[PDB]
Amino acid sequence: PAPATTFAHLDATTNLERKLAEMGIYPAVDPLASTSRILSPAVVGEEHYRVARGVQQVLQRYNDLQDIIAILGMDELSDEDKLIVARARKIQRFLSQPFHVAEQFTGMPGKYVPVKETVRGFKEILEGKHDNLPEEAFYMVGTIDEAVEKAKKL
Amino acid sequence: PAPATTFAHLDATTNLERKLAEMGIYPAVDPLASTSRILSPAVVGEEHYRVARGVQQVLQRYNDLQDIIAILGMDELSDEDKLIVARARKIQRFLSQPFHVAEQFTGMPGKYVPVKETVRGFKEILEGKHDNLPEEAFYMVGTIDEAVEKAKKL
Amino acid sequence: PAPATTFAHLDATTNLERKLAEMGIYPAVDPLASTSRILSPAVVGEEHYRVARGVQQVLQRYNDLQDIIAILGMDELSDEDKLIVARARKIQRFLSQPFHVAEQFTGMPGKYVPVKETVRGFKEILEGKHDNLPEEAFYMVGTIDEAVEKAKKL
Amino acid sequence: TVQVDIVTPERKVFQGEADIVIARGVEGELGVMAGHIPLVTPLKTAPVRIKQGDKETLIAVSGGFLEVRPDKVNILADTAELPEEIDVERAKKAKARHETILKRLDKTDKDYLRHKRALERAEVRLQVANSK
Amino acid sequence: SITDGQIFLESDLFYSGVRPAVNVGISVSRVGGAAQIKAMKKVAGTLRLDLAQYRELQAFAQFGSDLDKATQAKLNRGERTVEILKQDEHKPMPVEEQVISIYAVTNGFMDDIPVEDVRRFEEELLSFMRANKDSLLDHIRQTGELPDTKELDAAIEEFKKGFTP
Amino acid sequence: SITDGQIFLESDLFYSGVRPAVNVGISVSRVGGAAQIKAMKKVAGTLRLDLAQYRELQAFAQFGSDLDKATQAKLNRGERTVEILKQDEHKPMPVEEQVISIYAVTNGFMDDIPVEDVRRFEEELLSFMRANKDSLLDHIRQTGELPDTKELDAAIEEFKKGFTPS
Amino acid sequence: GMREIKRRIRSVKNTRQITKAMKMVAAAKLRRAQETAENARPYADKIKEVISSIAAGTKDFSHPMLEARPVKKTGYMVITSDRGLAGPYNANILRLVSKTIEERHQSKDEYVIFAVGRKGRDFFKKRGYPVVEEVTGISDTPSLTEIQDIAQSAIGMFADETFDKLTIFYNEFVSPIVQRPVEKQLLPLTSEEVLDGPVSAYEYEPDSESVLEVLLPKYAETLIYSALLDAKASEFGARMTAMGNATDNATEMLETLTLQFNRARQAAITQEIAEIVAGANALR
Ligand SMILES: Nc1ncnc2c1ncn2[C@@H]1O[C@H](COP(=O)(O)OP(=O)(O)OP(=O)(O)O)[C@@H](O)[C@H]1O
Ligand SMILES: [Mg+2]
Asked: Membrane spanning segments where (chains A, B, C) (predicted)?
């Protein structure tokens, strides 16, 4: 009865997962388990919704192949799946972000990324525009432009 | 407490179970939990009793295997059990029957089956005479003859 | 609350369980739940303690596999586990014992088994010395020698 | 030099360039060097010795046959084992078994040939394991 | 809900020979590394990840030598660290000796040794470190830091050559 | 036990994108065809039972091209009717337009069309029926009966010739 | 009652960890079985090359193994698994053997069976089929030597005339989801399929007729081995998908068991309290 009654009032969930924190993905928000009632075309645009569902489809597929990859290796996957795994790994890193409140500990500047830019960035990764940037480029950056800039330094 | 106390006042019971209804077995009668004071050789005659107990033995065995079946399916079973499960499933379907009052829901005409025919049908299934008819043949029929007739249309 | 509070007042416990009684294991003593303050190398000596812990390890492992065996079956266990299950079942039977006072119920004469012999018997079962005696041999006997003798009658 | 591939039906066992390949053919020893004439012959259950200058790797081939083309040399055996990967104590159990059975079998008994064959497979494995 | 963590003990663990019977997965210290000397915080880092991998892969332990060599080694490391965390009753260990023992097993120095010998290996190792290499132990008691890893690796490998399985 | 039937909505369906997420197996109307215009009672007659069988048989659908041709066709019809019964929020449909859409899919008129195109096919079909074949739609609003099935089949096949798949 | 459901959840949850893993091991072994088949295919193609070269330079070419006879008796090889937990893998292949023997032969005298794998021989022996030779305990991902004695004696029986046709029933691999039971002829061979290979100039020691006497039985041998490796891939595909389903069915049952456990948990607390409060209200 306690959580059941609390749940009737929730609009959204943010599920922090230790597995992601251990990989170095901060904030360690589970991008599949977290949910919101207002991730709908009615509220965020049509484009936002399409992109977010696209991102989740790619991550979900990658999640399903985790066992298959570990045993059968990467030669066993179809060409469609190998491309999805490539993007999933970039997506997973681009969801990480340095925080202003960690500026003292990381020693790196934090980043505020507006929604328009978040949507644009993930749209482009899904579209294939950054399939040739190395993976580390997307890790701990703000906008997609900062990822392109970080690639030059590597 | 309500139904539990009600049982003491009854000479026969028909115990309807939702699991059967959800499978499409109508009427949804638990053939092991249902009981009658007059299911004895003295009243229904020696053949009836023998057949009914035969049917219940087969269903009871099938009931016991329901955990193993729910996970592994039928593939791991001994040859003795696979034959019992085959017959149990035919028996379970032949206990279903279209109702005159349900012509509005089922769209099928109802059937009245006299006791002589009911006993004869289940006797034959237990004897192995219809081990080669497909399972759907026994579902929603009437006499054993209607099951043989339905098999031809499949 | 009654038995739960009673535990605090005891230096040794003998926990009788119905599951064992239903198998025919008398006395029906849970060999994992029963405990004693003096089951330590300091009091019973180093060999006794080692054997007792050995027995409990084998029984615990068997307990864990009971679920797996019931569904996936005994052929799919490793060679190490099948040997543990074999011994566990012999151990479980050798813990049973006919009582002097129970000559009416068992129908057999009772047996007093000194500690030295109890330790010796279970030590030998763990060591593998009786892996080819049938299970019934260990059931309702006193010393390990009576089990060897009972095997000949089978 | 010439390229050699010794192969069982499951894996490739030895691969490389080689100065010469000493192999006990069924009609007598053969030394296959570069430019040898195209040839196919069954081999006896024996070692095959492969020379690379100062180095000599020895392989326990059984039930094999040799195929030389102008360019390369293939040996396709049922069995082929390198010295370091031969189980020495198993080769002695294989030997002991088939040796004591051979002692008492009649010389055209049903299985005489099979146990003679299995004895030689183990005899060769013991030599090859010593070249380590 | 009041305390800063909990140590859960289980009967299944106890009777299987894991004593003290600490469920390491479910038990928690909310204070964590703050309550640990730097040496222990360093070596325990790897113990936790080793056992987390062990507990996931434990289903595959009846398939011995069917498994690929990566998972085989993870199971072998796991059973050995479990043996290290077993501990006799009324026999507390100084933190400096714990750090060495955990360092040994987590850096692979017991991978060559039978699982049944691990606990005796530890007892024999520490009596060796106390008698002969006390300068290394003392570094930890004073600084709270690990000694120089090259000196420490050498001293363990020195001990190893006098150990008979 | 009080009401005259129920509409059960299931989470697994909902979050997989079947919206409205009606569990066809459990749901029911005790009033049934009595509460339906004759056109809809005709086209829908077995629809519930057809989809309940689809959803059961969908579990064993991994065998594309290997599975027998009877069950293959049932799965292909099923995925298409599922797409028809998806429906966006705050977009109610007139009964006459529902009957045409359900008629189309249940008589096979979308069997050669990709599953991903079915929803656009429907939207394009109905805007065609409204603009050009309104006499057929109007028959249903007035009589409550289906129009002449031969005229209706022709009108859909007419639309089909101007439809570009992907 | 929670006493049962505590333990029933325990059972299903442990069991699911094992089915989950078993699919992962079956998945590993399918890779190793297809790896080793990619060595067996060129090994057998090379033997085929040498055989098609010797036939291409003998003027009159014929062998007993390529010569079709009147079928006096027949030999049947049947490949099945040793272990189960592989769905209907063994059922399907054995039903096909049962069917094709019912259609053809009217008594036990007309055919004779080589049972590869325990499931097969147990089936056939129980029903008194003419099982003339057997092999069990074949290793997962096996070498040719493990099939050799039963291949050689089966070729031996055709090489004389104990029977005049040798045939092999196994589950043909397609995907990890699909495995079709099939029958294939081994002997007599068909020169249409044994001679289509690259013809080359070789010297033969002692001579060409002598090396052809070792290679042709050595080739039939490898067909039986290829069928075993396809049959092993089919075993491990069938097991992947059977334990896959058992894992999913276990999670499904864990939902309905969790639902029951929590009804019971909640009802215990609810009902216990009402009792405590009813007792206290009889005094207050
Ligand atoms: N002594 C050995 N050491 C390592 N591998 C061996 C040894 N003997 C055989 N093998 C391998 O095991 C398989 C069996 O080969 P084969 O049947 O020719 O041997 P065998 O003499 O029958 O073996 P054994 O009699 O010892 O069982 C092959 O894959 C082979 O390479
Ligand atoms: Mg051998």
From this structure: none
